[PDB]
Write a structure and sequence with these properties.
Elements lengths: L5 E9 L4 E8 L5 E7 L7 H17 L7 E5 L5 E5 L6 H7 L6 H20 L12 E5 L2 E4 L11 H6 L4 H16 L11 H10 L11 H10 L10 H19 L1
Antiparallel strand pairs: 1-2, 2-3, 3-5, 4-5, 6-7
Helix pairs in contact: 3-5, 3-8, 5-7
Family: Belongs to the protein kinase superfamily. Tyr protein kinase family. FAK subfamily.
Protein name: Protein-tyrosine kinase 2-beta
Subcellular location: Cytoplasm; Cytoplasm, Perinuclear region; Cell membrane; Cell junction, Focal adhesion
């Protein structure tokens, strides 16, 4: 990718490392792909600049149908990381707009897709730390994509909050919170608390309540993921199998 092949159109948002621009990339066969162009502030530390690149290289290599796609990298300053722009935007906002139309079938589908992404991450012992509907993009009405790697106290396992310990097991906790968000049509977890109060409530043994439209079987699954003991939590491979079963059941009920 040469820089000329990309045209910047407007500001998209601010990212951790620097501004993100909305653009269009014209590929070799002449097609036009909508892109998000991530940049790195000129004031950044060498450690920051390296991290930006090293995260980019991970996104480049994942190539998974439920993780956001990287189009290309322009290393030459100003460094651009060119990501696919998805039309429907963030899953959280998407759920909010379409709460009247979306049925449980589709909500379980999105959960399943994210679970599969995480099973792949699990397989390379890569810890994500940002499984939330704000960081999931809607590519199509029946296809969601986990965004980039990761504080989100209301989403975090006890061991993450207390100690900043992050493992695949803490990701499982967080994935369940994410499923709770999906079945709740984009509600913030523990929206009734201050961040300070969360670990307190968690320590007591209190959990997020079952969303109205969440099937009991799925809530039971969430409850296992929120076991205080990270060793007792299901693995993502097991969860894919469970969610596959629930999905198929909900599909047949729907038809």
């Amino acid at each position: 990718i040469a820089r000329e092949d990309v045209v910047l159109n407007r500001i998209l948002g601010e990212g951790f490392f620097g501004e993100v621009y909305e653009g269009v990339y014209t590929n070799h066969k002449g097609e036009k792909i909508n892109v998000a162009v991530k940049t790195c502030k000129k004031d950044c530390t060498l450690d920051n600049k390296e991290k930006f690149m090293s995260e980019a290289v991970i996104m480049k290599n994942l190539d998974h149908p439920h993780i956001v796609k990287l189009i290309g990298i322009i290393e030459e300053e100003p460094t651009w990381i060119i990501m696919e722009l998805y039309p429907y935007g963030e899953l959280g906002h998407y759920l909010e707009r379409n709460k009247n139309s979306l049925k449980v079938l589709t909500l379980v589908l999105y959960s399943l897709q994210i679970c599969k992404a995480m099973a792949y991450l699990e397989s390379i012992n890569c810890v994500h730390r940002d499984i939330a509907v704000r960081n999931i993009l809607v590519a199509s009405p029946e296809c969601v994509k986990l965004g980039d790697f990761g504080l989100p106290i209301k989403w975090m396992s006890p061991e993450s909050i207390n100690f900043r310990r992050f493992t695949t097991a803490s990701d499982v906790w967080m994935f369940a919170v994410c499923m709770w968000e999906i079945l709740s049509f984009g509600k913030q977890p523990f929206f009734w608390l201050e961040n300070k109060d969360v670990i307190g409530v968690l320590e007591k043994g209190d959990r997020l309540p079952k969303p109205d439209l969440c099937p009991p079987v799925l809530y039971t699954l969430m409850t296992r993921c929120w076991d205080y003991d990270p060793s007792d939590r299901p693995r993502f491979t097991e969860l894919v199998c469970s969610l596959s079963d629930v999905y198929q059941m909900e599909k047949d009920i729907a038809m």
